Amino acid sequence: ASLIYRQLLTNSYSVDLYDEIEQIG
Amino acid sequence: LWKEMQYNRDIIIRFKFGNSIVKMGGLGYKWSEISYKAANYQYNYLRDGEQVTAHTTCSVNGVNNFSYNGGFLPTDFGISRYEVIKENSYVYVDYWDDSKAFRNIVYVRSLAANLNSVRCTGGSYHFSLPVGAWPVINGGAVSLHFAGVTLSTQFTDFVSLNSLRFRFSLTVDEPPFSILRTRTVNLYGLPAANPNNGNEYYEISGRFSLISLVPTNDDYQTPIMNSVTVRQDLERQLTNLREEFNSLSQEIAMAQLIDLALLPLDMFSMFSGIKSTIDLTKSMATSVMKKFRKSKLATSISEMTNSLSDAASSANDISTQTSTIGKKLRLKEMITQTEGMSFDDISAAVLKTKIDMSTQIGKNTLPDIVTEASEKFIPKRSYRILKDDEVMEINTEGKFFAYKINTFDEVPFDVNKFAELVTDSPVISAIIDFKTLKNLNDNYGITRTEALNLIKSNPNMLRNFINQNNPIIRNRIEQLILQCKL
Amino acid sequence: NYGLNIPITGSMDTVYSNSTREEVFLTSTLCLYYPTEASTQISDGEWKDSLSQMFLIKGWPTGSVYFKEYSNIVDFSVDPQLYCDYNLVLMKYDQSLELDMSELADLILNEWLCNPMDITLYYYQQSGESNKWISMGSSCTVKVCPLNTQTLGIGCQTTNVDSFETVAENEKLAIVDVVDGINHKINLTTTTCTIRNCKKLGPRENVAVIQVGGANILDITADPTTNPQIERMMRVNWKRWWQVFYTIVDYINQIVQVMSKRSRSLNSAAFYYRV
Amino acid sequence: QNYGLNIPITGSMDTVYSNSTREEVFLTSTLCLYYPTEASTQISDGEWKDSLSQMFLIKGWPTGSVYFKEYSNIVDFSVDPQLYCDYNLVLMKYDQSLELDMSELADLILNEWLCNPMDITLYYYQQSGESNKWISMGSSCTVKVCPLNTQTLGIGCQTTNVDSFETVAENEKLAIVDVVDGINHKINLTTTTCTIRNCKKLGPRENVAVIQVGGANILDITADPTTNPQIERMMRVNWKRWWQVFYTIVDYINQIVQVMSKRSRSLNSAAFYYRV
Amino acid sequence: NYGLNIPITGSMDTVYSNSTREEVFLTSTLCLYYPTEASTQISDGEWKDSLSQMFLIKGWPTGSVYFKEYSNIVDFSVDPQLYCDYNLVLMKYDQSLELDMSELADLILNEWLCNPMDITLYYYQQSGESNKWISMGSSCTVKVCPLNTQTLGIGCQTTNVDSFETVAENEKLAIVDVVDGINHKINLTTTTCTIRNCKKLGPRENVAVIQVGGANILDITADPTTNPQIERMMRVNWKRWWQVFYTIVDYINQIVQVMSKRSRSLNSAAFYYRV
Amino acid sequence: QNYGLNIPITGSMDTVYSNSTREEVFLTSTLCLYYPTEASTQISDGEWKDSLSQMFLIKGWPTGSVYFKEYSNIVDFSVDPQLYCDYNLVLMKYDQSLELDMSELADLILNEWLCNPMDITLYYYQQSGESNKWISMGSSCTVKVCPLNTQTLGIGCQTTNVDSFETVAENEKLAIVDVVDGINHKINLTTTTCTIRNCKKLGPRENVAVIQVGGANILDITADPTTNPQIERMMRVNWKRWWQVFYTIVDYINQIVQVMSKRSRSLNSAAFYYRV
Ligand SMILES: *[C@@H]1O[C@H](CO)[C@@H](O)[C@H](O)[C@H]1NC(C)=O
Ligand SMILES: *[C@@H]1O[C@H](CO)[C@@H](O)[C@H](O)[C@H]1NC(C)=O
Ligand SMILES: *[C@@H]1O[C@H](CO)[C@@H](O)[C@H](O)[C@H]1NC(C)=O
Ligand SMILES: *[C@@H]1O[C@H](CO)[C@@H](O)[C@H](O)[C@H]1NC(C)=O
Ligand SMILES: *[C@@H]1O[C@H](CO)[C@@H](O)[C@H](O)[C@H]1NC(C)=O
Ligand SMILES: *[C@@H]1O[C@H](CO)[C@@H](O)[C@H](O)[C@H]1NC(C)=O
Ligand SMILES: *[C@@H]1O[C@H](CO)[C@@H](O)[C@H](O)[C@H]1NC(C)=O
Ligand SMILES: *[C@@H]1O[C@H](CO)[C@@H](O)[C@H](O)[C@H]1NC(C)=O
Ligand SMILES: [Ca+2]
Ligand SMILES: [Ca+2]
Ligand SMILES: [Ca+2]
Ligand SMILES: [Ca+2]
Ligand SMILES: [Ca+2]
Ligand SMILES: [Ca+2]
Ligand SMILES: [Ca+2]
Ligand SMILES: [Ca+2]
Ligand SMILES: [Ca+2]
Ligand SMILES: [Ca+2]
Ligand SMILES: [Ca+2]
Ligand SMILES: [Ca+2]
Ligand SMILES: [Ca+2]
Ligand SMILES: [Ca+2]
Ligand SMILES: [Ca+2]
Ligand SMILES: [Ca+2]
């Protein structure tokens, strides 16, 4: 069940391109 | 507490393109810009036995800028940058109507449409030449094919009308657009000159579905005309939902929580199955990650790794060292995969059992909850390292023990000998800490096998003791659940 | 917090005894509800005092017997406030008032829990067989419009009141049952007549409805399949109101032995308004 | 569920109740504010109901979980005040000469009254004892009483001549009249305009709280003179602006509900005693 | 540095140490604030000298007891300054000034920690029950407009001051509480009145307030549930100001017993300014 | 937390001391300049406050954490200087004939006075020792002092005739007057304009530091003649250009800060001693 926190931290890089969506839009 | 309501309707969408022109000086031969512009339209139509009044707004994107310029001479024909739409360009048609469905369009669970394509053809534009042969724009055509509905809003003069936006694709068609009497023939595409061909309106017909989430505090009594708009909705207080989440632990169970905690929870497994709106089911996961990154725990992970990297090239006394390495052990627990029961398992289990029985009501608020619980749940925890059947246990508050495995009696601690092994030997979360374990061995005398298993935090032995209805383990795990209070 | 979960153990041998006491009033109160027609036919006005005197010999102290006059069944059905402890309601049977008498009986003889219904702003539903809607006022013209899953009125257009279905028109009281599980849009004249979502709890056993006239028609249960005869659904045969009142006074011991004073409420309203 | 019977509840004293936590009452109940119309006039608004509902939502109460039931003034509110609701706050604006009218209204809404009717033209009435009153409500009650000795010969009054009767209230829209307990009485009041009821005081009504907005403490709800208790539900706050009053109430609403409690009669437990 | 963290131990059988009454009386300084109409009714001007000579017998050295007249209650309420070691504030009650007296009592009887507020620039937000906004000046008109999360007003436009909601107008002092959690926009007459964001710490035990007139009205705690009667809510019934002053002089020892000198700040201000 | 008790605190001479709090003070505290309006006049600008805040940001102080204050001149600033601000610097341009007034201002701010009111009309005031002065502030202070014999008879003056009094200060915006200890004095002071306070000197003011822009060390902040100390918070700098002065201050703000320190009486540790 703790796997999700590791998944959040590991996959957190995509927030960069998500905020890129937000600011370019 | 939030009820689905289907509002699917068959609609007819009427719209017309908008044309803007700007003249260039001289005697009136040139032109500066011919471009598409946002265009409104009103109409009424009969459907289902009542006359519904509709308001549409068409706009264009992706437009090409062709050109033509006969030269610098003060009378030679040309258009400096005349546009067209072709493969790339899209057209949006915001649609609104007075029907009951569009009053309940604030919160939506799903929304999708089926519209029939249409063929738009360009008109005839006679460029205003003062004298001589009359140039003739003609031809050009595209086909609108529907692709995807979204939410939108017309910024109409009197109010802002929440509305549905239909994104139609394009498809260039047979009639080769030309500038007749001029050097441009056998193009293809719909230019901005006369996109409407004099038609009163271009027409689409289709059916759009919608699943709104009108609120409900009682089964028999469901509303119409959702009027809790984001003017009427406001930030729920931080302490208020903190108190709500703390109150939610009234109900959590004992063994079922451990059963859930023994799953692999991933992005899909957790964040799916949340009774949320479309605008939040789109990016809930990324929203959670964005605020998870900046949490105190996450920046502590970053500081740990960066400090170690910088060290790689830089070259109650005991309580303080034990506490610092306890924080370090917590960081290591979060980053790595431990083979024990791993307190963060219980934290995530409580988190899932809390958030599943809530609802998204126009604000995400899983950010500030998931990320906040990740750092606040189980504030004081404990770890242990077994070696030579002399397990050394440590508390994040600074306490320390060192006790044998075969019999649970403690030994003088060895600082800097625990620290050499905590770096490499696998850390074991101490969900059955030393105090409760000593109580258990004293009262319910246990064997070597289950002693080793409980030391290792083996799920099999933990659940065996829980299903024995052992009071010691039952109470211990109940307190574990109870510190999860944000 | 009267501990309504721990079991109570009786005994099957010992002993038939007395009821000890209860101290909230000197004693119970009997309470007649008669129509104006009784007064007009009696042609008197010392008759309430005479009836009290004749109750005294039956064994009711003087202050315990109260009398309430009402215009008729329909004008009484609106907000029937039972201000009292042992209620009898003498209902003169009249043809074409069968369903009105059944409405009033279903209202008073049973214990109701009513919530408000803001018709202008919400749709409405029915949870189950035990849930009615009760509309009361001067004139209740309750036009409903059921809606399918898609919120399109079936057999009606929600925006055209004319297409609606009039379940009950121009009634002082109307108990309406629409199909349970389908949303409805309601329409009734909110200036005069109000309407409430009323669930049915158990029976209210302070009240005895005495049908004065014809056959046994009071169908308290809206279910067509069931038609029980309750011990409080009294029926008597009349030619003269003096004879009716004399029978009531003579047999009043049985009239109160069939009822029970316990099921009483602070307010006199015939339902619990739960807002 | 074993209604209609007092059966003693046993309960341990040293039980953990770790699972026990706060009761978020606002998630289910319905808060319910009564104010004088001059509050609205001074506010000089008309989306203020929406604004207050929004602020209540921010405090926790769902959208429809708050009601704003206006009343014209204290006396006209005092005539048959039926608070069919779930958490009643009443903003009583104190003004001089409304002392006993405020006190009697407060008693009426804070004590659960069990009322039987009365036929003034037919029977003589007497209060059983300490907890019994006669509540007279109407557009204009004018209660006159002739005490009767054991021989039905009125003392200080002639049983026929209404003039010799002893007035106990006039032009009062509400009057909780108390007379000597154990004395037969003949009564006279304007039967068309005023109704009167023989009422007993049960325990306290915890559904309702009174925010007294104006002056000093006066609310002697207990008709006995010797006891003048200060019940927690009789809150008091000073004022110079109705917005300040309403903002105070909204900001501190949770403590108000903690002071109050659910109507004990409306629960299932009280099914067969006097459920209301 | 102080040993706040470490605990203090102390036995229970320790003998009572002797009285420090002489120490406090010889070192401290009583200090009476009183209205001007007190002196006007006294009609004198050797009277402060007489009062000092009469405190001298009660056990105050001559150069200790001070007198600091103030114009009236509402005017004293603006920037009230606790000049002095033991503070007494005579306060004549009159109708319609109840809230003003309560405001002053709340302001001076409690230790307020005030931060600056810039009305024009930023939207300000109340942290909790122990936070208020205190406005002081010749004329304060606190008009508030609460805002959504989108910086949009509710019940008010953010740009039209005439839609705002007044919470106190023309008051010299106003302790305004707003719903805790909201972003408000404030309109207040910035040239003549100043607003501050004031938390409320524990109680200032240096000050006593003597209500000279009527009934108990001082609701020091804005919470409407609690209405404590603090020991320093002194009250007397008056007709002659000489009688009031004689009462204070006679029972001055008990007043100081009620108060506690230790809660004296360096500044004469009634609050801690913490830019 | 056991406020109000001066209980012993133990500490080991070997515990490894902890890392810097420069970042802590920058992020949490607020720095606060006071300067004369002549400075801005010579600067001849008006985005300069914003520019200096931007420069301070690189040193570490958040944008809103620096507060600039102007004043007309030293004597005008002396009357009632309220340094309600977490790290105070006071620029002080020295020109001749202002040495005593400058030292008076420094003595007022760099130390921490607890002080009581005086009522000149009523009593005769002594001074209790070295730590006791009288501080007179106002638009025009002129303190005329008549000492008295034990028989309440003036020496070198007369209690009646004010003109025979000994004028200790005149037209001073601020005047700290000391007098012989243990002699009763009758004061005459301009009660409408100037206000006088009988003031005891507690410990020093952590919070404020004075930067003399002009000449040599003249600030004697000790009324004693036998000692003229050198305080860390009392600093000097030569100048010809106010931009240069401000740049030196901004560049060395680390050093000025860690010469000063947090106001000890604004802490919670001093809660019930003389908290300010
Ligand atoms: C019960 O009631 C009857 C009434 O006839 C009475 O005679 C009897 O005495 C009562 N029981 C007892 C134990 O007295
Ligand atoms: C009920 O119907 C009438 C006419 O049929 C209409 O005028 C009225 O508005 C309806 N009531 C509501 C609440 O819509
Ligand atoms: C709460 O816990 C106690 C003992 O821990 C148990 O007896 C009780 O049934 C529990 N009740 C609830 C509602 O959790
Ligand atoms: C009250 O007194 C009036 C005046 O005599 C009388 O007409 C009226 O009947 C009396 N009320 C009753 C209930 O008898
Ligand atoms: C305290 O008083 C008692 C009797 O009044 C006396 O015996 C004792 O010496 C005194 N102690 C001090 C310290 O003054
Ligand atoms: C207060 O409102 C007036 C107009 O009503 C306005 O001129 C003034 O600027 C407002 N105050 C502030 C601080 O903006
Ligand atoms: C204190 O500073 C040193 C270097 O200046 C650094 O190595 C050490 O980690 C710092 N202490 C902490 C607790 O970070
Ligand atoms: C000082 O003396 C003048 C007369 O020269 C007098 O007016 C004034 O009142 C005196 N000061 C005081 C404090 O009385
Ligand atoms: Ca009917
Ligand atoms: Ca139909
Ligand atoms: Ca039904
Ligand atoms: Ca039936
Ligand atoms: Ca008489
Ligand atoms: Ca009255
Ligand atoms: Ca009585
Ligand atoms: Ca009383
Ligand atoms: Ca407004
Ligand atoms: Ca005021
Ligand atoms: Ca507040
Ligand atoms: Ca209060
Ligand atoms: Ca001289
Ligand atoms: Ca000076
Ligand atoms: Ca001296
Ligand atoms: Ca010196």
> For a pocket test of ligand 2, which of C140, C158, C187, C193 has the largest count of ligand atoms closer than 8 A to its C-beta?
C187
DSSP B404-457: ESSS--B----TTTHHHHHTTSPPEE-SS-HHHHHHHHHHS---HHHHHHHHHT
Supply F145's token pair: 């002092």
Supply D234's token pair: 């009789």
- The CA-based angle C132-C134-C136, given to 5 degrees, is 175
**Radius of gyration over alpha carbons of chain A, in Å?**
12
Largest CA distance in chain A: 36
Q: Which amino acid residue places its CA nearest to atom 11 of ligand 2? A: C187
Q: Is the peptide bond before F75 cis (omega within 30 degrees of 0)?
A: no
Token pair 């796997």 is found at: A3
User: Looking at the partner chain, which of A2, A3, A12 has a beta carbon nearest the beta carbon of B292?
Assistant: A12
Contact between D58 and B482 using a beta-carbon 8 Å cutoff: no
Three-class DSSP category at B260: helix
E81 vs chain D: nearest CA distance in angstroms? 24
- The H or E element that residue B79 is part of is strand B78-85
- Residue C49 marked ligand-binding: no
User: Looking at the partner chain, which of B231, B237, B240 has a beta carbon nearest the beta carbon of E148?
Assistant: B231
Contact between C127 and B219 using a beta-carbon 8 Å cutoff: yes
Contact between E155 and D244 using a beta-carbon 8 Å cutoff: no
Euclidean distance between CA atoms B108 and B8, whole angstroms: 12
Identify the bridge partners of residue F125 per DSSP, sorted by sequence position: F185
Q: In angstroms, what CA-CA distances link F214 with F209, F219, F238, F255, F257?
A: 16, 12, 6, 20, 21
- The CA-based angle B220-B222-B226, given to 5 degrees, is 170
Residue D208 CA to ligand 20 center (angstroms) comes to 18
Euclidean distance between CA atoms F3 and C65, whole angstroms: 74
Residue F224 CA to ligand 23 center (angstroms) comes to 10
Residue C90 dihedral angles phi and psi, to the nearest 5°: -80, 110
Locate the ligand 2 atom nearest the alpha carbon of residue C119 and give its number: 13
DSSP D259-274: HS---GGGSGGGTTTT
Supply D203's token pair: 């325990």
Identify the bridge partners of residue F34 per DSSP, sorted by sequence position: F69, F90
> For a pocket test of ligand 4, which of D124, D160, D162 has the largest count of ligand atoms closer than 8 A to its C-beta?
D162
In chain E, what is the straight-line distance between the N-terminal and C-terminal CA atoms, in Å? 23
Euclidean distance between CA atoms E142 and E140, whole angstroms: 6
Chain C hits for D2, Cβ within 8 Å: 3-8
Q: In angstroms, what CA-CA distances link F112 with E64, F85, F272?
A: 22, 15, 16
Chain C hits for B215, Cβ within 8 Å: none
Length of chain E: 275
With an 8 Å Cβ cutoff, is D211 touching chain E?
A: yes
Residue B235 dihedral angles phi and psi, to the nearest 5°: -55, 115
Question: Is-contact D187 D120, C-beta < 8 A?
Answer: yes
Euclidean distance between CA atoms B308 and B294, whole angstroms: 20
DSSP C161-227: GGGSEEEEEEEEEEEE-PPTTS-EEEE--TTT-EEEEEEEEEE-TTEEEEE-SSS-----SS-SS--
* Dihedral angle over CA of E35, E38, E40, E45, nearest 10: -100
- Deposited experimental method: cryo-EM
At residue C90, what is the residue type? L
Euclidean distance between CA atoms D82 and D113, whole angstroms: 12
Contact between B478 and D54 using a beta-carbon 8 Å cutoff: no
DSSP F56-87: HHHHT--GGGEEEEEES-HHHHHSS----SSE
> Of D150, D190, D154, nearest to D173 (Cα)?
D190
β-sheet with F195-204: strand ranges across:
F111-117, F195-204, F132-141, F172-177
User: Looking at the partner chain, which of B231, B237, B240 has a beta carbon nearest the beta carbon of E152?
Assistant: B231
> Of D134, D148, D144, D145, nearest to D195 (Cα)?
D134
- The H or E element that residue A15 is part of is helix A14-24
Residue E163 CA to ligand 6 center (angstroms) comes to 12
- The H or E element that residue D58 is part of is helix D48-59
Question: Is-contact F163 F106, C-beta < 8 A?
Answer: no
Supply E12's token pair: 């229970």
E271 vs chain F: nearest CA distance in angstroms? 9
Q: Which amino acid residue places its CA nearest to atom 8 of ligand 3? A: D17
Question: Is-contact D47 E142, C-beta < 8 A?
Answer: no
> Of B164, B146, B145, nearest to B278 (Cα)?
B164
> Of B343, B347, B336, nearest to B374 (Cα)?
B347
Q: How many CA atoms within 13 Å lie on the side-chain side of E3?
A: 11
Euclidean distance between CA atoms B312 and B304, whole angstroms: 12
Task: Give the chains touching D; criterion: ≥3 Cβ pairs < 8 Å.
Answer: B, C, E
What are the E-state strand segments in chain E? 30-35, 66-70, 86-91, 110-116, 131-147, 165-176, 183-187, 193-203, 207-211, 233-235, 271-273
What are the E-state strand segments in chain F? 31-36, 66-71, 87-92, 111-117, 132-141, 144-147, 166-167, 172-177, 185-188, 195-204, 208-212, 234-236
Residue E185 CA to ligand 17 center (angstroms) comes to 13
Identify the bridge partners of residue E67 per DSSP, sorted by sequence position: E32
Locate the ligand 8 atom nearest the alpha carbon of residue F187 and give its number: 13
Identify the bridge partners of residue B121 per DSSP, sorted by sequence position: B141
Supply F146's token pair: 């008549």
> Of F29, F21, F20, F17, nearest to F267 (Cα)?
F29
Euclidean distance between CA atoms F110 and D31, whole angstroms: 57
Three-class DSSP category at D129: coil
Question: Is-contact D176 D78, C-beta < 8 A?
Answer: no
Euclidean distance between CA atoms B437 and B429, whole angstroms: 13
- Residue C165 marked ligand-binding: yes
* CB of E56 shorter than 6 A to ligand 6: no
Supply F11's token pair: 């500490």
Euclidean distance between CA atoms B51 and B47, whole angstroms: 6
Q: Which amino acid residue places its CA nearest to atom 1 of ligand 4? A: D188
- The H or E element that residue B113 is part of is strand B108-115
* CB of E158 shorter than 6 A to ligand 6: no
Euclidean distance between CA atoms B167 and E71, whole angstroms: 74
Number of other residues whose CB lies within 10 A of the CB of residue E35: 20
Supply F274's token pair: 């003389």
Interface of C with D in 13-42 (CB under 8 A): 24-26, 29
Ligand nearest to the CA of B474: 3
Task: Give the chains touching C; criterion: ≥3 Cβ pairs < 8 Å.
Answer: B, D
- The H or E element that residue B241 is part of is helix B238-248
> Of B483, B204, B231, nearest to B362 (Cα)?
B231
Three-class DSSP category at B373: helix
Euclidean distance between CA atoms F56 and F60, whole angstroms: 6
Euclidean distance between CA atoms F78 and F101, whole angstroms: 8
Residue E141 dihedral angles phi and psi, to the nearest 5°: -130, 85
